[PDB]
Design a protein around this nucleic acid. Structure first.
Lengths: 50, 333, 171, 126
RNA sequence: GUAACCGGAGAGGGAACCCACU
């Protein structure tokens, strides 16, 4: 997530338990970059993905 | 709300709701400050950190110490035309303050903007509201705000504090009849503040505020650094005590610490019934450990402070700047 | 009226609650979800005395959640159009009298109040009183009441009562 | 259509067992003792507290065996199940009062038997 | 430590025909 969308091995969205969707590619405020164990992160396709 | 000074009521100070004069006062305050946005046009300090403290050696500074008060701007534009402005941009009308002109004592100041505080000072066991003039913005259409900081301090002194004393010396102004005292906030060199922290006023001091000698700039001024004791820390949290139990999860109640302009819970607090009274109310919190905890509830404020404010305070509390921590840092110079 | 009924409910469990104690967490979830709850059809669910049966939980396809059909005995309170129960006063007001029944709160109106129960604003506590000054209805008094109509508000039941009926008054 | 006087009850709600204030109190106090022990449990609801203090102030007889005795003796006489608990909660002192409070009993049983049942109820009153 | 100064707004018709790709 800290790498983000610009760098390829990164994430595009981070989805929280409430369902709030944060977009990583447009200036994410450093507060919501932090993540807990319940959240989902939409990483890019990587090696070994099926 | 509209409360001039919390704790003590001051006679003659009257909040004004009348839109025609409110608009003129606010707009011409913006005009005097050359302030881009809306709201409070005055210069706003920032909390000191490891990066801020460097700025002290890059350029000379003047020092004063923060005392408990509310941010408050006097606009002097006539005999009774004194409209009185706080950080919330609210305007109050004060009656009996008269500002003599130094050349003609019968002439009163106009188009003058001062920077100061309402501080309650208990002397002889009685609360005496006082105004400390630490900066001047505008003076009789002259751009004194573009002058040097020491120059503006001397304008404050000679043009305001002295003519009034001249007129109480002759009795044409009565110190007893004015609603509250008017003074200038004392300023010293960076060397003097070291004695402040054999410090016998260590408990009587709320912190330090450092003023650069440069020209006045409105809004957020990055090189004006306030020093706040870390153990004494501290933001206005808008709280929604919420029973957040996710789908498939045991229902749980938590306190969500919201801030200004950020739609999501900035942080969480250990919600408790002894904290349930102030449901949906603006509060201050202390970040001693990884948990923000409640000291006092601010009924006066209605909005949580900004996200950048939250960031600045988080950085400041993460690097606790203590009196011994900067004492040596200036003693080396 | 208070009852003892068996009810059916299905609770979803997050996979993190599976643990070594899943049934205890199921019991806790059912308690926290149906304790103090209100339904317009069945009335107030005061407490669950026991859980009759906990069925086989089905794993939702595409979702980690598991739902258990649960049988449990619970005590319910749902009032009637036509039942009579004793009630306790909470507030005296000129529009009417506020009285408290179990969990639910109902009010008696002045026109439903018999005309003998005159108002006494000037009594230090506001009172409902006769001209003969015999019956004194006041704060915290326990009274008989006849509940005629019920309303559902945010899935919570409030009702209204009548007091014209005979013998129906102060205990 | 749902009327207590004419004895229309929902079909889903027909077979439920009706309860007394005193036995509701003993059940709720059992639950309170269960929750105060075995800590790390949710705090009881305001509804629970209101029902508990209501049935405490409205408890007719505290004895547990008295509950079973009055239940058994009144059910031995052929009466509808809903009427047992309402009669025992109201505790009328005269059969005229009992018939006024519950119109269903009006004409169901004679005055002498109804008053004898009521007198037994006040006899077991604590 | 101000009345966040706008809140990142992206959703951008459709039908028809023609050519072309595997």
């Amino acid at each position: 997530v800290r790498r983000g969308n610009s760098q390829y091995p990164g994430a595009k969205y981070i989805i929280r338990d409430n369902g709030d969707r944060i977009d990583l590619r447009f200036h994410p405020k450093p507060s919501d970059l932090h993540l807990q164990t319940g959240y989902k992160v939409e990483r890019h396709m990587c090696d070994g993905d099926i | 709300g509209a409360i001039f000074l919390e704790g003590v009521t001051v006679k003659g100070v009257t909040q004004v709701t009348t839109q025609p004069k409110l608009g003129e006062v606010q707009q011409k305050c913006h005009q005097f400050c050359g302030w881009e946005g809306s709201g409070f046009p005055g210069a706003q300090p920032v909390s000191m950190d490891k990066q801020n403290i460097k700025l002290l050696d890059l350029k000379p500074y003047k020092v004063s110490w923060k005392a408990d008060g509310t941010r408050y701007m006097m606009l002097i534009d006539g005999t009774n035309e004194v409209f009185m402005i706080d950080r919330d941009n609210s305007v109050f009308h004060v009656s009996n303050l008269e500002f003599p002109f130094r050349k003609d004592l019968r002439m009163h100041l106009s188009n003058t903007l001062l920077d100061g505080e309402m501080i309650i000072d208990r002397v002889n066991g009685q609360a005496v509201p006082r105004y400390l003039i630490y900066d001047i913005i505008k003076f009789n259409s002259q751009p004194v705000g573009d002058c040097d900081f020491n120059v503006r301090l001397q304008c404050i002194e000679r043009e305001i504090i002295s003519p009034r004393h001249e007129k109480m010396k002759t009795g044409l102004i009565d110190k007893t009849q004015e609603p509250f005292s008017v003074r200038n906030k004392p300023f010293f060199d960076i060397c003097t503040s070291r004695k402040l922290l054999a410090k016998e006023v260590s408990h009587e001091m709320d912190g330090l505020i450092f003023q650069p000698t440069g020209k006045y700039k409105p809004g957020r001024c990055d090189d004006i650094l306030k020093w706040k004791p870390p153990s004494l820390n501290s933001v206005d949290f808008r709280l929604k005590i919420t029973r957040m139990g996710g789908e498939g999860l045991l229902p749980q109640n938590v306190g969500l610490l919201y801030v200004g302009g950020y739609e999501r819970p900035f942080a969480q607090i250990k919600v408790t019934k002894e904290l349930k009274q102030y449901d949906n109310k603006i509060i201050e919190c202390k970040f001693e450990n990884n948990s923000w905890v409640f000291m006092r509830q601010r009924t006066d404020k209605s909005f949580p402070n900004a996200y950048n404010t939250a960031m600045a305070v988080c950085n400041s509390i993460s690097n606790p700047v203590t009196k011994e921590m900067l004492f040596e840092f200036i003693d080396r110079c | 009226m208070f009852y003892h009924i068996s009810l059916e409910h299905e609770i979803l469990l997050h996979p993190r609650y599976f643990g070594p104690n899943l049934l205890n967490t199921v019991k806790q979830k059912l308690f926290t979800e149906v304790e103090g709850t209100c339904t317009g059809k069945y009335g107030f669910v005061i407490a669950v005395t026991t859980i009759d049966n906990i069925g086989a939980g089905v794993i939702q396809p595409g979702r980690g959640f598991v739902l258990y059909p649960v049988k449990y005995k619970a005590i319910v309170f749902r009032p009637f159009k036509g039942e009579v129960v004793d009630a306790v006063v909470t507030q005296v007001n000129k529009v009417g009298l506020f009285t408290e029944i179990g969990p639910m709160s109902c009010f008696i109106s002045r026109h439903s109040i018999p005309s003998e129960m005159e108002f006494d604003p000037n009594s230090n506590p506001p009172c409902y009183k006769t001209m003969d000054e015999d019956i004194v209805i006041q704060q915290d008094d326990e009274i008989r009441l006849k509940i005629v109509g019920t309303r559902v508000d945010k899935n919570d039941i409030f009702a209204i009562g009548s007091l014209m009926d005979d013998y129906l008054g102060l205990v | 259509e749902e009327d207590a006087s004419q004895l229309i009850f929902p079909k889903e709600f027909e077979t439920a067992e009706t309860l007394l204030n005193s036995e509701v109190h003993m059940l709720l106090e059992h639950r309170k003792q269960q929750n105060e022990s075995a800590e790390d449990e949710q705090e009881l609801s305001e509804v629970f507290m209101k029902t508990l203090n209501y049935t405490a102030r409205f408890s007719r007889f505290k004895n547990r065996e008295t509950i079973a005795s009055v239940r058994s003796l009144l059910l031995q006489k052929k009466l509808h199940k809903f009427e047992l608990a309402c009669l025992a909660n109201l505790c009328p002192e005269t059969a005229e009062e009992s018939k006024a409070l519950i119109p269903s009993l009006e004409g169901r049983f004679e005055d002498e038997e109804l008053q004898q049942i009521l007198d037994d109820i006040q006899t077991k009153r604590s």
